[PDB]
Structures are given as structure tokens and as C-alpha cells.
Design a protein around this ligand. Sequence first.
Ligand SMILES: Nc1nc2c(ncn2[C@@H]2O[C@H](COP(=O)(O)OP(=O)(O)O)[C@@H](O)[C@H]2O)c(=O)[nH]1
Ligand SMILES: Nc1nc2c(ncn2[C@@H]2O[C@H](COP(=O)(O)OP(=O)(O)O)[C@@H](O)[C@H]2O)c(=O)[nH]1
Ligand SMILES: Nc1nc2c(ncn2[C@@H]2O[C@H](COP(=O)(O)O)[C@@H](O)[C@H]2O)c(=O)[nH]1
Ligand code: ALF
Ligand code: ALF
Ligand SMILES: [Mg+2]
Ligand SMILES: [Mg+2]
Lengths: 281, 290
Amino acid sequence: AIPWGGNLEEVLEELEMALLAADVGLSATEEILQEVRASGRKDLKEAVKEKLVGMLEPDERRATLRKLGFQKPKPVEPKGRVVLVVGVNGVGKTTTIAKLGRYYQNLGKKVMFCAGDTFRAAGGTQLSEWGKRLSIPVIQGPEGTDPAALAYDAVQAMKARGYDLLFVDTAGRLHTKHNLMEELKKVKRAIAKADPEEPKEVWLVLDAVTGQNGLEQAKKFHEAVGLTGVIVTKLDGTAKGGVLIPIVRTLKVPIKFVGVGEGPDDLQPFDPEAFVEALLE
Amino acid sequence: QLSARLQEAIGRLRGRGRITEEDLKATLREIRRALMDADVNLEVARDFVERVREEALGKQVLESLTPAEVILATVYEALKEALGGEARLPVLKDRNLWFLVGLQGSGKTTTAAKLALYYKGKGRRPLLVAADTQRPAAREQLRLLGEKVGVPVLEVMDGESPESIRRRVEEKARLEARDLILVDTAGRLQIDEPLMGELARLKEVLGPDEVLLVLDAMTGQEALSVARAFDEKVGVTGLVLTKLDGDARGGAALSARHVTGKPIYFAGVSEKPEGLEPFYPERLAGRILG
Ligand SMILES: Nc1nc2c(ncn2[C@@H]2O[C@H](COP(=O)(O)OP(=O)(O)O)[C@@H](O)[C@H]2O)c(=O)[nH]1
Ligand SMILES: Nc1nc2c(ncn2[C@@H]2O[C@H](COP(=O)(O)OP(=O)(O)O)[C@@H](O)[C@H]2O)c(=O)[nH]1
Ligand SMILES: Nc1nc2c(ncn2[C@@H]2O[C@H](COP(=O)(O)O)[C@@H](O)[C@H]2O)c(=O)[nH]1
Ligand code: ALF
Ligand code: ALF
Ligand SMILES: [Mg+2]
Ligand SMILES: [Mg+2]
């Protein structure tokens, strides 16, 4: 662990190696260490935690109540009816949509899935299996079908049935492939074509084991489709999801949920403090 | 091709004649930082520049009139070596059974089909084994891929024992005269003891000749810790590096090799069954440094 209560130099030296081992990156680690060094506080533990929690917060009110010595949770509401789920390959987008469905059906919402991975073998069937398990209707087509056309049909079906939420799965794609990014853009427009207000949420899925490439994923997907949120998966692993620090710092996209398993309940709403605690553990 | 940072570090020192030991340490510090930026684990990156230090001094870099050229050459050379030196493919025999192991979603199922197609083209008669019973549609996934590459797929039953698996696989391989058995195992955490135990027991019963750690090129700092655990708890023999068609630098490959010493046999370069290449250490050395 980090030996707090050690001499200043040993504390900062260990904190540097902690953030770097957590995949926080050289740039952001330098940012954090300069200001912890500058603000000169004996309570290094409380000072660092405050700042880290601070990057990972789009909200000073919670910090205000914290520092006033006062604490509340409150379920994550998507802003609209369509949540479009994006990210690279094998990060957990399909598994995460199933968890969201479990999360929102537990809050009493009518949830629909669009099985928009029409590229990968069993890409759609996989979400279909989850729909069956959770008793959630799934809009899917044969492999090779236009996911934009499918996304369109899914919004239309959601609207027709009076459903509250539609999660649109998308095939994993690398951000270096411009044609696949354009296709992603085309899926988004297809959604708005069926309902101009939508999608209100565009959620990036990020695998916690990802190092510095995760920042490039966030920038490139942001540019293409406008992120409104980020989910970090596989946090049940030894990795800390540190690349989130540069992501939130640079892009100001809030972290919505964390994935901590391969089952449908293994989702939690993001907790900046429990995250910073685990990060420095 | 070199990275912005390293273009500066080495550029600084050109034409200056001889350089100081301080100049060396300053340079080696920038190489270290560059490797950490390329996702090389921080202990491994530390050891790597210490290796460079010895070699550069063993080339009498202090007395050289072109020391920046010496330093840069020694980085290119040490990283190539540390990635395996030359391209190396597995040595096959009359009976061949391999596991594909690793973290969740690293590309094991997809890679199995790629290998099946690759070795089919070389006269091998592969058998694919869908051993992932938990991931939804995982057995249909490998079946569809098997059908595409013209290779049979045995699908493990729910709750089936390793002993029963060995039995049906031995049976099908024999009755069909199949000499390359590709076992697709589920992704698992390296700290998940029951599942790491399951994998060790499956190894114990099936006796694979190769155990390939499928590693995603974008994996960060945990690569060292992940490679070590799979190799200590199960025993790895080789590596496949996936998603090199992205722009991750791939420094996790050095971390994995550093702690395991195992060859990196293949690169995955697309989502399609054709997307497989022999791994070239020199090619990734350049990638990491660029
Ligand atoms: N351990 C763990 N595994 C996860 C988590 N989320 C997803 N996975 C696994 O990652 C693998 C790939 O996920 P999948 O949903 O297919 O990825 P997609 O390609 O983005 O749709 C599967 O084995 C999932 O069960 C998580 O939070 N924890
Ligand atoms: N672009 C690219 N994608 C890959 C590569 N290897 C695997 N994938 C993709 O990564 C995702 C996860 O692959 P899968 O084989 O299901 O993961 P597994 O859980 O390890 O079996 C799938 O969408 C694959 O198409 C690769 O070399 N390049
Ligand atoms: N997600 C994903 N989709 C792909 C990939 N390659 C092809 N496709 C799908 O197939 C269409 C084009 O196929 P292609 O003409 O490239 O053979 C693309 O518009 C895309 O939907 C890939 O690597 N990843
Ligand atoms: F395999 Al994916 F999105 F990459 F389902
Ligand atoms: F999702 Al896997 F091996 F991790 F099929
Ligand atoms: Mg999926
Ligand atoms: Mg698989």
C-alpha cells in the first residue's frame, strides 16, 4: 500500500507509482503531484482523495456538503428514451446492456434492446440470449443487416409499444477505422430519424484493463457521436480503471456505472469515493 | 517513425561530439517515460533502460563521437531482442492439442478460428473445441466460425467434466484423423482462484502441448501481473497479441515477455479469420518507439 504518515518525499514517491500502476498516465500523474506538492497539506491522504474525487465529479454540491460535514445516492436516470452504447472490441457493451436492462427493470421501467451488432458471429444472438433470460424484448436481424436500419426499426417499435427505455447495442469497432466510425454516425442519425429527440444518451464502454489507449478511444468516439456518459467494466479485476482520470479531466464526460462481473446484477452506479479508495488501495 | 518525445531526446544530442554521463541518464529517463506511455509496465520499463545502460557503456558510449546514434541503435536492438529477436512460429508434431487462455474478451474465440484456418492451409486437420459454457451464444459463435473456415467444432455440454471432454475430443480427433486440437477456454480473472483452478485441472487432464495466452494490444499496466499469474497458476508456453489493427502501442507484449520469457507467436490484425500474422519483434519494437 501507500505508507501515509511516512515522510513527505516517501508519500509522494509512492503516490506517483500508485497512480502510474493504476494506469492514470504520465501527464495526469504530473498534474496531480504538482498540485499536491504545491497546496502543501499535512493531511496528504485527505488532500489527494479530495482532488481525485474532484476530477471524477461533475458536481460541486456533493463536495460542498462533504466539506460542510453533512450524503445521499439516487438512481441514474437516462435523459431520454434511447441509450446508444458504443466502444471497441470485447469491452463489454452487450453484457453491460443486459445489466442495464436488469437495473432498470428492477426500477420498474419497460426496457427494450436493439441487438445492433450485426457483424460479429453470434453478435446479435448473444443479446437475444440475455433478452430471454431477463424477459426483455430484443430487436435483432440476420448477420450482415444494416444496423442503422435495425436501430430505426427498434426506436419505432419502442415508441409503438409505450416503452420507457431502448438500449442500442453496436458492434465493437476500432476507432482507427473511419468507415466503421461513419457507420456509427449513420446509426445515430437513423435513431434521430425515428425520433428527433434521440438518442439522449450516448454511452462509451471502457474496459478497466485498458491503459493509455482508452483516452484515444474516448476522444475519437466523442468526436464522432458526442459522449454523454462512460461505463467502466471489468473492475472486479486487479486493474483500477485509472485512464478514466485523463478521460474525465480532458473530456468532462461523467462516469455512469461500473461493471464488476459477468452476471446481470454485477453493475453499480459510479461512486467517486469508493473508486478513489480502491484506486489507492 | 519515432515518437514526438524520442525525436526530441535523441535530436538534442546529434552533432555535439562526445556526451556526458548526465546526458546519458537524461536520455534513458526519457526512453523510460516513453515506454510507460507505450503501456510498458513501470518495473519492466525500469529494467529495460538499465539493460540499455549496460549495453551502451559496453559499446563505450562515453567515448563515442556519435553517442546519440549509439544510444538509439541500442534501444532499437534491445527492444527487438526483448520481444523475441526474430519471428518464431510453433513447432508442430504428430499429435497437437493447444489451449487459448486469458482475460475476458481478449480475442480467444476469434483467434481459435484464425489458427484453425491458418493450419488447415498447411495440411493440418484442426478440431475446434468450444469450452466456454458461460458466455451466452459462445458455442454458436465458434460453430459459425468453424463453418466459415471449413473446420469441425466440438461443443462442450453444460456441466461436462474435463474427463468427459478429454474422452469426446480423443474420440472425434481419432475417428476424423485430426491432429490440431484448438481448445477455446473462457476468459477469466487471474485472481479468480476457482476458475484459475478449473483451467489448471483442464490442463492437467487434457495435456495440451501449447497454452497460448491471448493478450489484447491495448492492455495496460496489469499485463505483467496477468501474464505472471497465468504462467504460475497454469503454465503458459506462448503468446498471441490481438487487435494490432488498432493504434495502441502494444507495450504489454514486453511486460508479458519480460516476466514469462515466452515467445509471441502470432499477431491478430482484424476481426476476420484471415486476420492473422506471424509476430515480428522488430515490427513491434518500432511500434512501441513510434
Ligand atoms: N469480469 C468481468 N467481465 C466482463 C464484464 N463486462 C463484460 N465482461 C466480459 O467480457 C467479455 C466480452 O463482453 P461482451 O459484452 O461480449 O463485449 P462487446 O464485444 O463489447 O459486446 C464477456 O466474457 C463478458 O462476460 C465485467 O464487468 N467483469
Ligand atoms: N479488430 C480486431 N478485433 C479483434 C481481433 N481479435 C478479436 N477481435 C474482436 O474482439 C472481440 C472479442 O473477441 P472474442 O474472440 O469473442 O473474445 P474472447 O472472449 O477472448 O473469446 C470480437 O468482437 C472480435 O471480433 C483483432 O485481432 N482485431
Ligand atoms: N464492427 C465491425 N464491422 C465490420 C468490420 N468489417 C466489416 N464490417 C461490417 O461490414 C460492412 C462492410 O464490409 P466489408 O465491405 O468491409 O467486407 C461494414 O459497413 C461493417 O458494418 C469490422 O472489423 N468490425
Ligand atoms: F464482440 Al463486440 F461489441 F466487440 F460484441
Ligand atoms: F468473452 Al470470452 F473468452 F472472455 F468468450
Ligand atoms: Mg457485443
Ligand atoms: Mg470467446
